[PDB]
Amino acid sequence: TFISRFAPDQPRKGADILVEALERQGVETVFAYPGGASMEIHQALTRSSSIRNVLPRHEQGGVFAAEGYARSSGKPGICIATSGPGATNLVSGLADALLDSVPLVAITGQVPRRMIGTDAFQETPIVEVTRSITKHNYLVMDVEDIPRIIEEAFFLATSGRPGPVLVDVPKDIQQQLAIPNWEQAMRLPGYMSRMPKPPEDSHLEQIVRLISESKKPVLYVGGGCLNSSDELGRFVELTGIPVASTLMGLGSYPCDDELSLHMLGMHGTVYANYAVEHSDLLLAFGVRFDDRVTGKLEAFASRAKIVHIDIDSAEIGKNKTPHVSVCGDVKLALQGMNKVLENRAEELKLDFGVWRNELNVQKQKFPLSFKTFGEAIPPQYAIKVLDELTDGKAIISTGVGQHQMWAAQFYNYKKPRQWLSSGGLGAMGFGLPAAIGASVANPDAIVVDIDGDGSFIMNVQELATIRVENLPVKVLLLNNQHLGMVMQWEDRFYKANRAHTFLGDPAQEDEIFPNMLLFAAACGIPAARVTKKADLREAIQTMLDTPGPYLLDVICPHQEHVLPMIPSGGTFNDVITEGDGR
């Protein structure tokens, strides 16, 4: 089933063994930036015909690209960097992948073994630095271990709760000649013995019982459902329970469906948060009860029986104590409960119409809304138009801040892995690189980075990557000349006292700065600016129609505020629904 480029008895460099280790794992793409300690690895890379390398312009671009690749394909993302500065430049990406549970395998070059700990050239104790920001990590001490460690890394990064795994490879090991043993068994007894077994019928049937004994059920869906799109659908079909999603769960259940309550949390819909606030049964599937979502834990779903299904036991009962729990794959649980629900519909007679309408009225009285001023472009509107013109089938990556919230609020995702956004760590500059990985993973898809002017500029160097790699990446830049989300808090809680939130030039207060169009031009990427709400539709359509990469600079009034809003640590009763920075 696999053909090596070497004879089973022919010795080859550890670097070449590391690359074949990747090919044997099904790796087709990696994002690697060459450095002294990883030269061997890059040389081995060029000897490969099945693995393509997307050279980024910054190691951080590499990780974020790998994250996009992973988040949009369900496959693990692979990034490679040299020692020292190379490796430390991945740090934010690793922490981001760990907090969001995105499978990622990071390989870093290291100084030769004998040089470790001596303050050598371009040396950093990366394994020490990344131990708390990765699911697991390694320092290869012998070429003989390469096959086994690579297999283990991918396994660990992919199984259970996905996450990042870093593999540190000393240069001397990369140069050492050896004959790989692809038959080596993995040394993960503890981990493998702790892997959840499929859910028991007893547990699942008790849940279906609770569902039939409830009057106000609510589904609390998160990132753990990204691979249960179909199972969840059939489930909602058989129970008729309204679905509230987290930022990480967007797309598990179509936001356009009538049973969808959309996103809950700090910036969730008034009706989504309402449903939870008054539910008597909370079905938390693939969620981690984040503070962004729960606000004051005690007030969160205070009057309801909570069911929590998570693949990580450490998460069950971390913030909220469930009445019922199931440590396992939610995809399996949904399938199990689905069989039961089908072969008992007659006697169950599930009907939540009353509750559903109690919510549809809330959905009618307090829907997502925005205001249009003169000919200024409403960010929400731009995203609303993008949706329309792409028929909600585009892969959307974003930065962090207000634009991020709107991209989540005003675009309806049809499927999972269409939404690529940093939620746990919320790292700025994630948008452009993430789109790069996504595009490489989905060559025929519409990839759009809905970015902010602050987030966009942080990794603007990846524009060069986009041009050279010829990725049809579209950039919908919502330019508001400010660090949006932070200025919103300045307005709400600091009497609009600006403390370094303005990103333009004070010498020319009324001038878009910088001129993002020229950053695009510098990398041979066609771009245009839009300022009038009237030209928006045609502008976006152009971006979409023009083959290849494209940057649309959408100017927006900065005084916009993301609403609704439940202050940090607040209650549903503290939800803010009106106001802005005017």
Ligand X SMILES: Cc1cc2nc3c(=O)[nH]c(=O)nc-3n(C[C@H](O)[C@H](O)[C@H](O)COP(=O)(O)OP(=O)(O)OC[C@H]3O[C@@H](n4cnc5c(N)ncnc54)[C@H](O)[C@@H]3O)c2cc1C
Ligand Y SMILES: COC(=O)c1ccccc1S(=O)(=O)NC(=O)Nc1nc(C)nc(OC)n1
The residues that are catalytic are: 59, 121-122, 171, 485
User: Which CB sits closer to ligand Y, 152 or 491?
Assistant: 491
- CB burial readout 128-162, b (16+ within 10 A) else e: ebbeebbbbbbbbeebbbbbbbbbbbbbbbbbbbb
| Whole-number Å distance between alpha carbons of 344 and 310 | 25
Beta-sheet strands, E only, within 441-560: 447-452, 474-479, 527-530, 550-555
Strand partners, 530: 554
Could you tell me which stretch among 54-62, 107-115, 299-307, 521-529 binds ligand Y (CB under 6 A)?
107-115
Asked if residue 481 belongs to a known ligand binding site, the reply is yes
**CB-hemisphere CA count at 13 Å for 494?**
10
Residues in region 51-70 near its own copies by CB under 8 A:
53, 55, 57-58
Tokens of 93: 């990406």
For position 147 contacting Mg ion by CB under 5 A, the verdict is: no
User: Which CB sits closer to ligand X, 330 or 544?
Assistant: 330
For position 120 contacting ligand Y by CB under 6 A, the verdict is: yes
For position 121 contacting ligand Y by CB under 6 A, the verdict is: yes
Identify which of 167, 165, 171 has the alpha carbon closest to the alpha carbon of residue 34: 171
Residues in region 481-510 near Mg ion by CB under 5 A:
484
Smallest distance from ligand X to CB 233, Å: 16
Asked if 375 and 469 touch (Cβ cutoff 8 Å), the reply is no
For position 483 contacting its own copies by CB under 8 A, the verdict is: yes
Residues in region 409-448 near ligand X by CB under 6 A:
423-424, 426
Could you tell me which stretch among 118-126, 232-240, 347-355, 531-539 binds ligand Y (CB under 6 A)?
118-126
For position 480 contacting Mg ion by CB under 5 A, the verdict is: yes
193 binds, among its own copies, ligand Y, ligand X, none (CB under 5 to 8 A by kind): its own copies
Residues in region 21-50 near ligand Y by CB under 6 A:
36-37
Scanning 394-535, the segments in alpha helix (DSSP H) are 402-409, 431-441, 453-458, 462-469, 484-493, 516-522
Residues in region 440-479 near Mg ion by CB under 5 A:
452-454
Asked if residue 454 belongs to a known ligand binding site, the reply is yes
Residues in region 444-473 near its own copies by CB under 8 A:
454, 457-458, 460-461, 463-464, 467-468, 470
Asked if residue 423 belongs to a known ligand binding site, the reply is yes
In the complex, which residue's CB is closest to Mg ion? Answer: 452
Could you tell me which stretch among 11-19, 65-73, 143-151, 311-319 binds ligand X (CB under 6 A)?
311-319
For position 201 contacting its own copies by CB under 8 A, the verdict is: no
Binding mask 377-406 for ligand X (x = CB under 6 A): -----------------------x---xx-
| Whole-number Å distance between alpha carbons of 549 and 55 | 17
Asked if 479 and 512 touch (Cβ cutoff 8 Å), the reply is yes
Longest dimension (CA), the chain: 75
Breaks (C–N over 2.5 Å) after residues, the chain: none
Identify which of 135, 190, 138, 191 has the alpha carbon closest to the alpha carbon of residue 163: 135
Asked if 112 and 437 touch (Cβ cutoff 8 Å), the reply is no
Smallest distance from its own copies to CB 462, Å: 10
Q: Is 106 helix (H, G, I), strand (E, B) or coil?
A: strand
Whether a cis peptide bond, with omega within 30° of 0, leads into 164 is no
Residues in region 491-510 near its own copies by CB under 8 A:
494, 497-501, 503-507
For position 5 contacting its own copies by CB under 8 A, the verdict is: no
Asked if 401 and 485 touch (Cβ cutoff 8 Å), the reply is yes
Asked if residue 231 belongs to a known ligand binding site, the reply is no
500 binds, among its own copies, Mg ion, ligand X, none (CB under 5 to 8 A by kind): its own copies
Asked if residue 36 belongs to a known ligand binding site, the reply is no
| Whole-number Å distance between alpha carbons of 308 and 217 | 13
For position 300 contacting its own copies by CB under 8 A, the verdict is: no
Asked if residue 580 belongs to a known ligand binding site, the reply is no
For position 83 contacting ligand Y by CB under 6 A, the verdict is: yes
CA distances from 344 to 285, 306, 337, 340 (A): 22, 23, 11, 6
Instruction: Tell me the pairing of strands 474-479 and 52-53.
Output: unpaired
Give the annotated binding-site residues for FAD.
101, 161, 223, 246-247, 264-267, 286-290, 310-311, 329-330, 423-424
Q: Which residues are annotated as a binding site for (R)-imazaquin?
A: 135, 161
- The residues that touch ligand X, with contacts defined as CB under 6 A, are 100-101, 121, 161, 222-224, 227, 246-249, 263, 265-268, 286-288, 290, 292-293, 309-312, 315, 329-331, 400, 404-405, 423-424, 426, 485
